[PDB]
Design a binder for this molecule. Sequence first.
Ligand SMILES: *[C@@H]1O[C@H](CO)[C@@H](O[C@@H]2O[C@H](CO)[C@@H](O)[C@H](O)[C@H]2NC(C)=O)[C@H](O)[C@H]1NC(C)=O
Ligand code: NAG
Ligand code: NAG
Ligand code: NAG
Ligand code: NAG
Ligand code: NAG
Lengths: 50, 215, 49, 298, 50
Amino acid sequence: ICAQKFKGLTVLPPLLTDEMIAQYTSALLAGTITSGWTFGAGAALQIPFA
Amino acid sequence: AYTNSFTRGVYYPDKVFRSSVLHSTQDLFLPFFSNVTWFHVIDNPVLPFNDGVYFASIEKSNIIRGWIFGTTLDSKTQSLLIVNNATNVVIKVCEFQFCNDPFLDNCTFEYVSFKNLREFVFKNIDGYFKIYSKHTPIIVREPEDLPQGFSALEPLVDLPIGINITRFQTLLALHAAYYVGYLQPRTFLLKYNENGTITDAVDCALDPLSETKCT
Amino acid sequence: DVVNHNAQALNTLVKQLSSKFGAISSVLNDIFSRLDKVEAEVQIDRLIT
Amino acid sequence: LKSFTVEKGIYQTSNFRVQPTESIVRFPNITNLCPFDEVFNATRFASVYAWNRKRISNCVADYSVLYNLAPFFTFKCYGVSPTKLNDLCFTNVYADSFVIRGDEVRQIAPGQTGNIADYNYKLPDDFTGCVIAWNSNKLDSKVSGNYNYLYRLFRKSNLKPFERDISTEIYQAGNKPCNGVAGFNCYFPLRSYSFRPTYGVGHQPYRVVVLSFELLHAPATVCGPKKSTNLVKNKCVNFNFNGLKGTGVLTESNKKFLPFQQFGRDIADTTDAVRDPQTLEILDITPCSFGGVSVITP
Amino acid sequence: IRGDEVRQIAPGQTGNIADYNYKLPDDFTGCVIAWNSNKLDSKVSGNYNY
Ligand SMILES: *[C@@H]1O[C@H](CO)[C@@H](O[C@@H]2O[C@H](CO)[C@@H](O)[C@H](O)[C@H]2NC(C)=O)[C@H](O)[C@H]1NC(C)=O
Ligand SMILES: *[C@@H]1O[C@H](CO)[C@@H](O)[C@H](O)[C@H]1NC(C)=O
Ligand SMILES: *[C@@H]1O[C@H](CO)[C@@H](O)[C@H](O)[C@H]1NC(C)=O
Ligand SMILES: *[C@@H]1O[C@H](CO)[C@@H](O)[C@H](O)[C@H]1NC(C)=O
Ligand SMILES: *[C@@H]1O[C@H](CO)[C@@H](O)[C@H](O)[C@H]1NC(C)=O
Ligand SMILES: *[C@@H]1O[C@H](CO)[C@@H](O)[C@H](O)[C@H]1NC(C)=O
């Protein structure tokens, strides 16, 4: 990495970090479990999982 | 008498420090598992030089003192003579045979400067005689066969003699065995470690597995 | 493979500098120190291209 | 952006680089002027098969004296530039000083073909050096010819480069055996041109000196006249190590160099570690500090 | 010009002539014409005017 860094070759960091990606996936999975298909169409509507 | 060459014949092709790298080179190397001639000191026949000689000597009393090179070797043309008497190294290009010493065996350039295994590579390229040397303490139970292992030969001597050399002959101390192998133009893959020492080499012209390794 | 395709490409792009591209050397400081500018531009145009 | 109005966002601009502060020149401390007088200003120049290879090492080769030398004029060079010849360091220099016919002076060059270039003195194709010639008709040409210089017009094979052949035995020019007896198709090999001042300018004798350099990754013994400065570490400086120029930071390193090794190379085959020629110390070369610059604007 | 120093009359050249009395630029676009002086300048027992 340092040998290619000395040659003008660099790597920019991503805008979204892994914590923010995990927060997105946690929000999606929590909304899916607690509301089903409703939070993809509008406001999340609670419903029992059975 | 013949025996196996094993993985010997690896020398540094350049004087550049490289560390932790697989470097591919193309030079006159000794091929892996080639078939080296074995002589035992009782025996110094005249041998052809080809394009290079790997000379290995297993000794403890230093019976071999040097070599004589040349084409005709009968005071008709140039003849390189290298003698070491454990004090000074004498390198001459004199045409005279001069086979007189305490031990039984024009000058345009003169240069004065079983527990032991001495490995040498002699090659004559573009009028330059290159001598590569290595010495190691190894104890072997039988000197009938060449010892198995890997060794790197550091460059020692470069001479601008410019002499056509086709035959050579070793010299003995009289009042211990040696092996002769011939070099071939080969592509090699050398592994420079953290120390910069060539710890392993792959001959690209040995088998399809090593050809795949080189590609 | 997404990791390796970028790592191998960067390693190859580093390894392209050792190519001479028909010039006498791959070191531009060596070319400038060992030649005049008139043929040094000719030797260095190949490396640049 | 090549515009006078700039929209909002982040725009990448030109990079920043730390410029060098000082300049370091470091050469080995050889203080002996090089004996070019023994090669050029010699009273007698040897023959072709008197292959006198003068070895030059541990010199300070000032080429201005050779350039302003009275007899020798032509200064042809292959591989190096003559104006740069006072700025480089060579491991060893080899000089060959002969007298040759002026017709075959053009044969003293790589890739040439002729009697001289085949059987007398052949240069390799990768020859990096210089050829110097003077029309020696005023001195090396005598009345009724000078027979000290010998030429072998016929031989078994061409010579390999930088080799000599002083054998005086009779070569069988024809297919018939000769048995060491001179005669038809059994001529003496070493003939002569017998240079005279009355000859034509093409056939006049010429004193030629060929200087062959050795530009390797080896310790240097011959160096041009240049004054070495002090060593500055841990600072972005320009440097000149034995004719190797660069710009960077020289740091102390723990690299275990072999005693025959001088320079170190990385994966990209650039110089990464050098050996200081005065005091045997290993120095790592790091490029100076840099990076990208971005402009965040509304 | 001294005949050995005539070869300095070119861009990018060093020597006494180019360093101390007459230097050509590196962007030079023109012509150089050389003719042997012989009897015109070099005379018996030398000429001191150069
Ligand atoms: C170096 O010596 C060898 C040995 O004599 C030369 O090989 C001979 O070359 C001639 C010329 O064609 C042949 O007729 C012979 O058959 C070759 N072999 C022998 C054993 O004589 C070789 O040419 C020499 N090389 C140089 C550059 O002089
Ligand atoms: C070497 O050659 C001999 C024949 O002279 C043969 O018997 C022997 O097997 C060969 N050894 C190798 C390793 O090829
Ligand atoms: C070895 O040879 C050199 C050169 O001939 C000579 O000076 C020296 O005395 C010799 N040493 C012995 C121990 O014979
Ligand atoms: C030594 O070289 C010269 C070269 O001119 C030659 O005449 C002489 O015969 C050579 N010596 C011997 C013993 O052959
Ligand atoms: C060489 O190897 C030894 C042990 O393997 C190590 O201590 C030393 O630092 C190495 N030299 C280098 C990396 O220059
Ligand atoms: C000259 O170089 C030698 C080589 O090691 C060194 O020991 C010595 O100190 C140097 N002398 C000066 C004055 O730099």
